[PDB]
């Protein structure tokens, strides 16, 4: 079986600034999963950030943790299976290992721990300077 | 919550070689979980490697996927909280990013579904050279 998730972006940013996280995933899992971010601040356990869901037609759900209501948004194109984190008015309290995550089981976004994800992609280092 | 699972190890060797990797755990994970370890070949899906019995102190069971049987050899340190990974004879096709993990739902050392994991230690790159 081919990797489900393959993800891109991250790096250094100062404080203010913006950067977008990207992650594609099989035909498959994309249809048939809950797309979700997490990310693991040093020494931390990783913990939700935000999530979407496929709705009839265009539509879409989005649903986001209160440490990011506001700065993020989340978005997903299903011409590219692909799933976007823009994030803005990043402090140096959003330094993290940043993850993407699939839940096959979940239909509507929603907080989600850890323990029910089925597919992770590879963690990428955001670094965010004062 | 602090993070669960620290491993330490990794790098390039050759064909034939031997490294051992290791693990550290809450005391809370360690005498509560299966753990055990997966790795994620070049574009490729992460699959079971390897798993111990919960609390291995002077008694656990080992089991072991088919690919590393007789090779690759699990053990912990209670003292230390560690459980380590032993590879013998490493081939080019064991080359992969190896991962440690926790499930708190199984106690007795069997095959590991990476849907069921609760917690995961950060993916460390281990090469063997032709």
């Known amino acids: 079986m081919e990797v489900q998730l393959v993800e891109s972006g991250g790096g250094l940013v100062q404080a203010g600034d913006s950067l977008r996280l990207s992650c594609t995933a099989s035909?498959?899992?994309?249809?048939?999963?809950?797309m979700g971010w997490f990310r693991q601040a040093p020494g931390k356990e990783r913990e939700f950030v935000a999530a979407?869901?496929?709705?009839?037609?265009?539509?879409?759900?989005?649903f986001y943790a209160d440490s990011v209501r506001g700065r993020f948004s989340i978005s997903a194109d299903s011409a590219k299976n692909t799933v976007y984190l823009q994030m803005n008015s990043l402090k140096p309290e959003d330094t993290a290992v940043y993850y993407c995550?699939?839940?096959?089981?979940?239909?509507?976004?929603?907080?989600?721990?850890?323990?029910?994800?089925?597919?992770w992609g590879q963690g990428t280092q955001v670094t965010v300077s004062s | 919550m602090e993070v669960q699972l620290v491993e330490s190890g990794g790098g390039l060797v050759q064909a034939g070689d031997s490294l051992r990797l290791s693990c550290?755990?809450?005391?809370?994970?360690?005498?509560?979980?299966?753990?055990?370890?997966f790795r994620q070949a070049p574009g490729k899906e992460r699959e079971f490697?390897?798993?111990?019995?919960?609390?291995?102190?002077?008694?656990?069971?080992?089991?072991?996927?088919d690919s590393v049987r007789g090779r690759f050899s699990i053990s912990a340190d209670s003292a230390k909280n560690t459980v380590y990974l032993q590879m013998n004879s490493l081939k080019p096709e064991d080359t992969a990013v190896?991962?440690?993990?926790?499930?708190?739902?199984?106690?007795?050392?069997?095959?590991?579904?990476?849907?069921?994991?609760?917690?995961?230690?950060?993916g460390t790159q281990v090469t063997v050279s032709s």
């Open positions: 979407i869901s496929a709705a009839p037609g265009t539509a879409y759900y989005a």
């Open positions: 995550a699939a839940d096959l089981k979940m239909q509507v976004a929603a907080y989600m721990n850890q323990r029910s994800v089925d597919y």
């Open positions: 035909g498959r899992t994309f249809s048939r999963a809950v």
